[PDB]
Design an enzyme around this catalytic site. Sequence first.
Site, mmCIF file in Angstrom:
data_model
loop_
_atom_site.group_PDB
_atom_site.id
_atom_site.type_symbol
_atom_site.label_atom_id
_atom_site.label_comp_id
_atom_site.label_asym_id
_atom_site.label_seq_id
_atom_site.Cartn_x
_atom_site.Cartn_y
_atom_site.Cartn_z
ATOM 1 N N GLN A 276 0.812 -1.204 0.000
ATOM 2 C CA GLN A 276 0.000 0.000 0.000
ATOM 3 C C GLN A 276 0.852 1.263 0.000
ATOM 4 O O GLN A 276 0.324 2.353 -0.264
ATOM 5 C CB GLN A 276 -0.916 0.019 1.210
ATOM 6 C CG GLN A 276 -0.174 0.138 2.536
ATOM 7 C CD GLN A 276 -1.123 0.036 3.691
ATOM 8 O OE1 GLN A 276 -1.537 -1.056 4.084
ATOM 9 N NE2 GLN A 276 -1.538 1.189 4.204
ATOM 10 N N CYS B 44 -5.051 0.628 3.735
ATOM 11 C CA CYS B 44 -5.165 -0.778 4.101
ATOM 12 C C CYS B 44 -6.595 -1.275 3.987
ATOM 13 O O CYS B 44 -6.833 -2.410 3.560
ATOM 14 C CB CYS B 44 -4.654 -0.990 5.522
ATOM 15 S SG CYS B 44 -5.599 -0.039 6.732
ATOM 16 N N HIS C 168 -5.494 -1.337 11.590
ATOM 17 C CA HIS C 168 -4.946 -1.807 10.322
ATOM 18 C C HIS C 168 -5.833 -2.927 9.819
ATOM 19 O O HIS C 168 -6.036 -3.916 10.530
ATOM 20 C CB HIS C 168 -3.527 -2.306 10.503
ATOM 21 C CG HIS C 168 -2.855 -2.692 9.221
ATOM 22 N ND1 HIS C 168 -2.727 -1.819 8.165
ATOM 23 C CD2 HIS C 168 -2.237 -3.835 8.843
ATOM 24 C CE1 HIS C 168 -2.068 -2.412 7.181
ATOM 25 N NE2 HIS C 168 -1.751 -3.633 7.571
ATOM 26 N N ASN D 41 -1.049 -9.370 4.377
ATOM 27 C CA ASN D 41 -0.843 -7.963 4.655
ATOM 28 C C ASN D 41 -0.582 -7.228 3.346
ATOM 29 O O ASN D 41 -0.385 -7.838 2.294
ATOM 30 C CB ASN D 41 0.314 -7.783 5.645
ATOM 31 C CG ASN D 41 0.255 -6.452 6.378
ATOM 32 O OD1 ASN D 41 -0.649 -5.647 6.159
ATOM 33 N ND2 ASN D 41 1.215 -6.222 7.256
HETATM 34 C C1 LIG Z 1 -4.975 1.417 7.527
HETATM 35 C C2 LIG Z 1 -3.563 1.508 7.043
HETATM 36 O O1 LIG Z 1 -3.425 1.756 5.835
HETATM 37 O O2 LIG Z 1 -2.607 1.307 7.821
HETATM 38 C C3 LIG Z 1 -5.460 2.527 8.444
HETATM 39 O O3 LIG Z 1 -5.114 3.817 7.968
HETATM 40 C C4 LIG Z 1 -6.969 2.317 8.587
HETATM 41 O O4 LIG Z 1 -7.732 2.455 7.627
HETATM 42 N N1 LIG Z 1 -7.375 1.910 9.797
HETATM 43 C C5 LIG Z 1 -8.765 1.700 10.156
HETATM 44 C C6 LIG Z 1 -9.027 0.194 10.303
HETATM 45 C C7 LIG Z 1 -10.338 -0.151 10.962
HETATM 46 C C8 LIG Z 1 -11.518 -0.190 10.228
HETATM 47 C C9 LIG Z 1 -12.721 -0.509 10.839
HETATM 48 C C10 LIG Z 1 -12.757 -0.802 12.183
HETATM 49 C C11 LIG Z 1 -11.599 -0.776 12.923
HETATM 50 C C12 LIG Z 1 -10.393 -0.452 12.319
HETATM 51 C C13 LIG Z 1 -9.034 2.464 11.451
HETATM 52 O O5 LIG Z 1 -8.369 2.222 12.461
HETATM 53 N N2 LIG Z 1 -10.008 3.380 11.441
HETATM 54 C C14 LIG Z 1 -10.888 3.774 10.351
HETATM 55 C C15 LIG Z 1 -11.067 5.283 10.264
HETATM 56 C C16 LIG Z 1 -9.841 6.021 9.737
HETATM 57 C C17 LIG Z 1 -8.691 6.270 10.709
HETATM 58 C C18 LIG Z 1 -8.772 7.633 11.391
HETATM 59 N N3 LIG Z 1 -8.918 8.722 10.433
HETATM 60 C C19 LIG Z 1 -8.981 10.018 10.742
HETATM 61 C C20 LIG Z 1 -9.188 10.973 9.589
HETATM 62 O O6 LIG Z 1 -8.871 10.419 11.910
#
Ligand SMILES: *[C@@H](C(=O)O)[C@@H](O)C(=O)N[C@@H](Cc1ccccc1)C(=O)NCCCCCNC(C)=O
Length: 212
Positions: free
Chosen positions: A19, A25, A159, A175
Amino acid sequence: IPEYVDWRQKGAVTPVKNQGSCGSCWAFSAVVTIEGIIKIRTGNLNEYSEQELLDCDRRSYGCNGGYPWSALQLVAQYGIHYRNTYPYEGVQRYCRSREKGPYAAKTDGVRQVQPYNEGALLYSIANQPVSVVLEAAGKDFQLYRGGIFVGPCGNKVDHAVAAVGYGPNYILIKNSWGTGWGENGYIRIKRGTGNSYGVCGLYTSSFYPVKN
Ligand SMILES: *[C@@H](C(=O)O)[C@@H](O)C(=O)N[C@@H](Cc1ccccc1)C(=O)NCCCCCNC(C)=O
């Protein structure tokens, strides 16, 4: 369900991607479940566009993060293009789905796995690759080079990855950090610890696409 599942051996997993610096992710995660379910239903393994979800999922935040379930809902509601048509650029741009001609594939919906339930997750993995989340911030996860990973890690999930298999003592995870990380891009995370969160929070939030 069997003792071992490995969707890579059924030809349902495309090569490991990177990525890059973008917090995409969630899109990579969603895509490997779409790649998996299309192969399972149609016999064709194709690569689909993480970039399209990055660009087009308005409920997610582009490279700042997002939701596998949102991305999966968008492919159920509209569709997705081949990766070759809509290649990954590592930056959110505008949604270019319309410019790219007809969608390549289309799902029928999104289901959630019952959270905090190892058996429910395994049952889903035995059917298809599943989008799962975990805490990847810890240095132990980041420096993972192989073996069954037990942590240390908390449950501050951050993640999205994809579970593409399991064995007696692990869940097999694709991953999106390239082929140099972990086991050629994969991690085996310990299961069966009685921790309802899963190790590194792995059972927190798991989704898979439905395709009739
Ligand atoms: C993934 C990465 O590329 O490392 C990371 O940025 C991400 O998208 N994480 C998500 C994963 C997640 C999804 C659903 C439930 C629980 C976890 C995450 O932790 N949160 C999603 C919202 C975006 C992150 C916070 N964004 C802002 C703008 O504050």
